[PDB]
Design a protein around this ligand. Sequence first.
Ligand code: HEM
Ligand SMILES: C[C@]12CC[C@H](O)CC1=CC[C@@H]1[C@@H]2CC[C@]2(C)C(c3cccnc3)=CC[C@@H]12
Length: 466
Amino acid sequence: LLSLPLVGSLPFLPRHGHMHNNFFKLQKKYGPIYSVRMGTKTTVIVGHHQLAKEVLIKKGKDFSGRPQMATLDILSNNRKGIAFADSGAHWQLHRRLAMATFALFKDGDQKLEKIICQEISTLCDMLATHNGQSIDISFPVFVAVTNVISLICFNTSYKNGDPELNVIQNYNEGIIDNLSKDSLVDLVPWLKIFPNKTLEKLKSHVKIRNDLLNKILENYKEKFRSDSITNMLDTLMQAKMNSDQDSELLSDNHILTTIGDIFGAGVETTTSVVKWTLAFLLHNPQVKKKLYEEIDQNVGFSRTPTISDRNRLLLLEATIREVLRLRPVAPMLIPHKANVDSSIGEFAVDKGTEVIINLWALHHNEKEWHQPDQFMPERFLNPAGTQLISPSVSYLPFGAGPRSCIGEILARQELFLIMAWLLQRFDLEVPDDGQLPSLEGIPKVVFLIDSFKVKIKVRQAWREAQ
Ligand code: HEM
Ligand SMILES: C[C@]12CC[C@H](O)CC1=CC[C@@H]1[C@@H]2CC[C@]2(C)C(c3cccnc3)=CC[C@@H]12
């Protein structure tokens, strides 16, 4: 009896389980690095820290490209901006300019810390009005980080109730919904196989974002003054005029897309990580208690938390690290591409090949982490409890090398201060129908969590101390 001709083969079911996990499970059979061919395109998945660092750092330049995707073409206006732009002059310039802008916020009058604390104050005052009630903290937190990133991009913010905030939220949700069904990584390109309206819907949401950004740029062409460079838009406009090989790379569209990447990332990443952190604390009341104890003893109630408090609030800084391990914002980073013929772990990799780092695998490798599927912030502390440690070399929440996260400083500060101020001021408890958030998650371009509610109450201790 003969065997059928095989015209296709995939190692697991599509749309069943999470991609990053399915790739991980495959490592038991096939090892830490393997490939899949889809028509013409070849993709390599890497799931061990040694090989990953070779791709991100040692041979960083070789693998610093980004593959092209139809959905991403639309969001990025054909591969402009930073995150989805191929390696090249545009990417390098705009990335550099964006980084240079965060320097303008490291100290002084417009210090990043104060900008953030300003908006966390408004957030806390608003949340306190919901004393006694169960609520979804998504929108209130969304506003807070939106204002922070707006101040950094334009030196503007939004008053309570500005409906432009509801507009942004709508298109943010719609774009994220249609940019990918699940992860950006998608074995079969269903998009091109069956008739569908994904690109149509995606365009309609992107159009609204772009119209709003254009509106902002046009209104700002007048307020721009050369001697005063205080925000990201200033920096980008100052560069364009400074010419005078550089000027074609700073068109209006190049500038808006870059601002768009920053505005989007600044808001959806940090918002997501905050929700994830709360969710874990509702599942782990023992940890939560230890965090209240820690903050009462090291900051108390006579002032509000500041960045310098990260030197004393160690369990908090560790809790954040452990969320970023267990539920990475980008569990498969963003896809990389080989710019040139090269190699990984002595295996050949052709120019143009897609390369994916399975960070989830790195963060859950059993030989590198003790009980990796557990939420244990303790692992990032010495046994004493008195200083932070790095227990594994297999940890890269913000990536590394040329395409590493450029918003890391901002993220870490936003996350630390938000959690700090909330814990000082609020009991955050399971709602009265004792529903706990699902920790399973929803993979999109970002690793999101199902919406959930939290009962919020002002703390007796915080009240007494007024
Ligand atoms: C918890 C928060 C965040 C985490 C864990 C995070 C992590 C990451 C990761 C894993 C990557 C991909 C690295 C790669 O593709 O090799 C990335 C890229 C990027 N991140 Fe974030 N990020 C966070 C927040 C932010 C924020 C607040 C910004 C604000 C500007 C930002 C801006 C970017 C940009 C522009 C890229 C593209 C880099 C490039 O292609 O050159 N991120 N980030
Ligand atoms: C789609 C979205 C967010 C929805 C916006 O309407 C469009 C947008 C621009 C930037 C995207 C961002 C989602 C987060 C992305 C993909 C991101 C990011 C994501 C996670 C970690 N670090 C960076 C950088 C580009 C960011």
